Design an enzyme around this catalytic site. Structure first.
Site, mmCIF file in Angstrom:
data_model
loop_
_atom_site.group_PDB
_atom_site.id
_atom_site.type_symbol
_atom_site.label_atom_id
_atom_site.label_comp_id
_atom_site.label_asym_id
_atom_site.label_seq_id
_atom_site.Cartn_x
_atom_site.Cartn_y
_atom_site.Cartn_z
ATOM 1 N N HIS A 39 -13.481 73.019 14.787
ATOM 2 C CA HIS A 39 -14.399 73.050 13.651
ATOM 3 C C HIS A 39 -14.350 74.372 12.890
ATOM 4 O O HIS A 39 -14.756 74.421 11.729
ATOM 5 C CB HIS A 39 -15.832 72.771 14.146
ATOM 6 C CG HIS A 39 -16.774 72.287 13.081
ATOM 7 N ND1 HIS A 39 -16.616 71.081 12.430
ATOM 8 C CD2 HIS A 39 -17.907 72.836 12.579
ATOM 9 C CE1 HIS A 39 -17.602 70.914 11.568
ATOM 10 N NE2 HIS A 39 -18.398 71.964 11.635
ATOM 11 N N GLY A 141 -24.785 79.604 15.694
ATOM 12 C CA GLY A 141 -23.852 80.614 16.126
ATOM 13 C C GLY A 141 -23.380 80.436 17.548
ATOM 14 O O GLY A 141 -22.553 81.222 18.011
ATOM 15 N N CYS A 143 -21.779 77.732 18.780
ATOM 16 C CA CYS A 143 -20.597 76.898 18.904
ATOM 17 C C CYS A 143 -19.486 77.666 19.613
ATOM 18 O O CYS A 143 -19.195 78.813 19.264
ATOM 19 C CB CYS A 143 -20.144 76.457 17.499
ATOM 20 S SG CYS A 143 -18.962 75.125 17.485
HETATM 21 C C1 7YY Z 1 -29.106 75.131 16.403
HETATM 22 N N1 7YY Z 1 -27.873 74.903 17.132
HETATM 23 C C2 7YY Z 1 -27.788 74.546 18.398
HETATM 24 N N2 7YY Z 1 -26.483 74.424 18.711
HETATM 25 C C3 7YY Z 1 -25.810 74.739 17.586
HETATM 26 C C4 7YY Z 1 -24.301 74.759 17.501
HETATM 27 N N3 7YY Z 1 -23.720 74.734 16.167
HETATM 28 C C5 7YY Z 1 -23.267 75.859 15.647
HETATM 29 O O1 7YY Z 1 -23.390 77.065 16.313
HETATM 30 N N4 7YY Z 1 -22.687 75.852 14.455
HETATM 31 C C6 7YY Z 1 -22.554 74.720 13.806
HETATM 32 N N5 7YY Z 1 -21.894 74.746 12.523
HETATM 33 C C7 7YY Z 1 -21.335 75.999 12.060
HETATM 34 C C8 7YY Z 1 -21.916 76.613 10.950
HETATM 35 C C9 7YY Z 1 -21.405 77.826 10.467
HETATM 36 C C10 7YY Z 1 -21.760 78.704 9.376
HETATM 37 N N6 7YY Z 1 -20.921 79.711 9.425
HETATM 38 C C11 7YY Z 1 -20.938 80.819 8.492
HETATM 39 N N7 7YY Z 1 -20.073 79.576 10.443
HETATM 40 C C12 7YY Z 1 -20.328 78.437 11.112
HETATM 41 C C13 7YY Z 1 -19.748 77.822 12.244
HETATM 42 C C14 7YY Z 1 -20.250 76.615 12.716
HETATM 43 CL CL1 7YY Z 1 -19.487 75.855 14.144
HETATM 44 N N8 7YY Z 1 -22.992 73.583 14.317
HETATM 45 C C15 7YY Z 1 -22.852 72.336 13.602
HETATM 46 C C16 7YY Z 1 -21.597 71.594 14.067
HETATM 47 C C17 7YY Z 1 -20.656 72.218 14.869
HETATM 48 C C18 7YY Z 1 -19.535 71.506 15.268
HETATM 49 F F1 7YY Z 1 -18.586 72.084 16.063
HETATM 50 C C19 7YY Z 1 -19.344 70.210 14.836
HETATM 51 F F2 7YY Z 1 -18.235 69.518 15.225
HETATM 52 C C20 7YY Z 1 -20.275 69.590 14.025
HETATM 53 C C21 7YY Z 1 -21.389 70.304 13.640
HETATM 54 F F3 7YY Z 1 -22.312 69.726 12.840
HETATM 55 C C22 7YY Z 1 -23.578 73.591 15.512
HETATM 56 O O2 7YY Z 1 -23.972 72.567 15.942
HETATM 57 N N9 7YY Z 1 -26.644 75.034 16.626
#
Ligand code: 7YY
Ligand code: 7YY
Lengths: 298, 298
Positions: A39, A141, A143
């Site tokens: 991702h 953050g 992930c």
């Molecule tokens: C609240 N919460 C609980 N667990 C998570 C995990 N999570 C995450 O940390 N990040 C995600 N999206 C990103 C956004 C970004 C913005 N910037 C600047 N960089 C980013 C990197 C990421 Cl990975 N997501 C959403 C998500 C991550 C995936 F790997 C996926 F396949 C689908 C998704 F909808 C996330 O869930 N956040």
């Protein structure tokens, strides 16, 4: 009894940050490879319906910023394996532990090292639910944070965190990039299946109760595994497998209580409740302690 | 929302084994000093009623065997600070983190790295009880395990484990060797004072519940701080100070629920019970999350 995590130091020394453009997450540095969710190659507009093959063909080694703290690791190769990106780097991690990659079953527990921007932040024990989610504690953050077990100084990596579902539970892959459950790495609403109670772990908890002298629930009955499995499903409990019976072996031997006799005691609890009596100071039956966890803590 | 411990790697690098004759336990190796419980100098007979100054004057440096994994560290000096023995060794620990020794107050939380014969085994979060015990998870061989907090790569060591009391709770010292509570490092049955519930922590956890969507216990009743403290004291809850109210400020702002409004919810829970319902999956009111713990996790 409470949940205890493994000491996290061997995994802390493997955590790095991986950035693509502005998209940033955590990666795992073992020998000269960094593993992370693919991702990361998505821009904000790609996250909804990514074409990962097309996204990867446009990338070169020099588009990946891998950092151990503030120190950049130069990427010298990249490939995709299912939902994980593998970045070959020019430096072998001197902190690499003995390790293996495993795919766990529902009910198995593991420790999670929650990380943000490559920085370890906290550690806690988790269980894989039967609906292939985990009831974790993750912020944005997180992930790429990983789950693991440690057996005789060998770290068995079993989970890489990908996303949070609308119900607040969490979904991810093994370290070969294969999701647990029917999830895909797209930013789309995905509901978890209906969850069930992890029977083999409730049984482990009953054995822990007996080891500690709390044994009022031991009845005078036995059952067959098939009969028990059919009743269990009527109460939203998982059926037991042959492997489940076998991992209850050590506790059965330690207490002298046959596994099928404990099944009969649990069946009675399902069909009659606990009558305001407690087990291990708890009115609820705990289902996130495996048989291994019980012998470990007792 | 999970009980979450700090990553333990910075502390793992400091654990060693200390042995005197047959008696063995864990020590903490920082720079060229190993800190451990002075109980290590007791034989089986000494343990029951030790005169520690007498026992120590009869010891030489060569009587202390310090093992760091496979390597033996040579003791070149020894002294005693209250219940903690300090062994000067001829080698500095290269893994020594930035650290401080702090004495914590009842209600504050810390991570415990449980160790056995100098080897880390598990990590989990604990609170200092109002009666100065801790409800830990410790087995034989855990003497000398430490509790700590981490802030910006600085380890604040706050607890060194000494003993399990007859009730199953645990007692120990700060790293200057002063016990928390009315206990002594002697193998004799010791009771603690009657414990109370950490009110500010219960309120923090109720906020955690609301932040995570669990709101059934809220009401439209009001209370003053003094009238809440009257009921709290009736139920063996610690008093809530204006400092506690201020510390709960951020969680009140995040949820829009005034502190005294949450006090009114807790008051009703104390008076009515939980009606068989759960909060954050718990059948009892949880009091080992500080406000900072909740803010950090949420
Ligand atoms: C609240 N919460 C609980 N667990 C998570 C995990 N999570 C995450 O940390 N990040 C995600 N999206 C990103 C956004 C970004 C913005 N910037 C600047 N960089 C980013 C990197 C990421 Cl990975 N997501 C959403 C998500 C991550 C995936 F790997 C996926 F396949 C689908 C998704 F909808 C996330 O869930 N956040
Ligand atoms: C079940 N449990 C939970 N926590 C503890 C901690 N604990 C401990 O690990 N060891 C103790 N006694 C020792 C016996 C030894 C036998 N050999 C060969 N070597 C030994 C070393 C020790 Cl420390 N104790 C008891 C205890 C330890 C003290 F430091 C003390 F001041 C009073 C005590 F009664 C112990 O509680 N066990």
């Amino acid at each position: 009894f409470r949940k205890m995590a493994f000491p996290s130091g061997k995994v802390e020394g493997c955590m790095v940050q991986v950035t693509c453009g502005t998209t940033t997450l955590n990666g795992l540095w073992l020998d000269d490879v960094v593993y992370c969710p693919r991702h990361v190659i998505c821009t904000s507009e790609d996250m909804l319906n990514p074409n990962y093959e097309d996204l990867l063909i446009r990338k070169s080694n020099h588009n990946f910023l891998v950092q151990a703290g503030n120190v950049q690791l130069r990427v010298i190769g990249h490939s995709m394996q299912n939902c994980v990106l593998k970045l070959k780097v020019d430096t072998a991690n001197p902190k690499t532990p003995k390790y293996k990659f495993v795919r766990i079953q529902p009910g198995q527990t593991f420790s999670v090292l929650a990380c943000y921007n490559g920085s370890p932040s906290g550690v806690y024990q988790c269980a894989m639910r039967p609906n292939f989610t985990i009831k974790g504690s993750f912020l944005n953050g997180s992930c790429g944070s990983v789950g693991f077990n440690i057996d005789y100084d060998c770290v068995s990596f079993c989970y890489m965190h990908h996303m949070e579902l609308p119900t607040g539970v969490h979904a991810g892959t093994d370290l070969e990039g294969n999701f647990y459950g029917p999830f895909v790495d797209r930013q789309t609403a995905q509901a978890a299946g209906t969850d069930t109670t992890i029977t083999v772990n409730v049984l482990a908890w009953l054995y822990a109760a007996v080891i500690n002298g709390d044994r009022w629930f031991l009845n005078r009955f036995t059952t067959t595994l098939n009969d028990f499995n059919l009743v269990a499903m009527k109460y939203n409990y998982e059926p037991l497998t042959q492997d489940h019976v076998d991992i209850l072996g050590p506790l059965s031997a330690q207490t002298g209580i046959a596994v099928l006799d404990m099944c009969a005691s649990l069946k009675e609890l399902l069909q009659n409740g606990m009558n305001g009596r407690t087990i291990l100071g708890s009115a609820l039956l705990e289902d996130e302690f495996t048989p291994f966890d019980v012998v470990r803590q007792c």
